[PDB]
Homo-oligomer: A and B are copies of this chain.
């Protein structure tokens, strides 16, 4: 029974962290996309 319970802990603990890490990485990737769209620098040509 300890092994059966231990297996459940390992499986859920492993998978939940991975997906959390994946989505967290996805989150920053989306945020970077929004930041870059605002960070477009072609407006600097006004000096020219």
Is the C-beta of A27 less than 8 angstroms from some C-beta in chain B? no
Is the C-beta of A28 less than 8 angstroms from some C-beta in chain B? no
How many protomers of this protein does the assembly include? 2
List the interface of chain A (C-beta within 8 A of B).
2-3, 5-6, 9-10, 13-14, 17, 21, 33-34, 37, 40, 42-43, 45, 48
A22 to chain B, nearest CB (A): 13
A6 to chain B, nearest CB (A): 6
Given contacts A17-B48, A48-B17, contact A42 B10 (CB under 8 A): yes
Q: Can you offer 14 A-B residue contacts whose CB atoms are under 8 A?
A: A2-B33, A2-B34, A3-B37, A5-B37, A9-B40, A9-B42, A10-B40, A10-B42, A13-B42, A13-B43, A14-B42, A17-B45, A17-B48, A21-B48
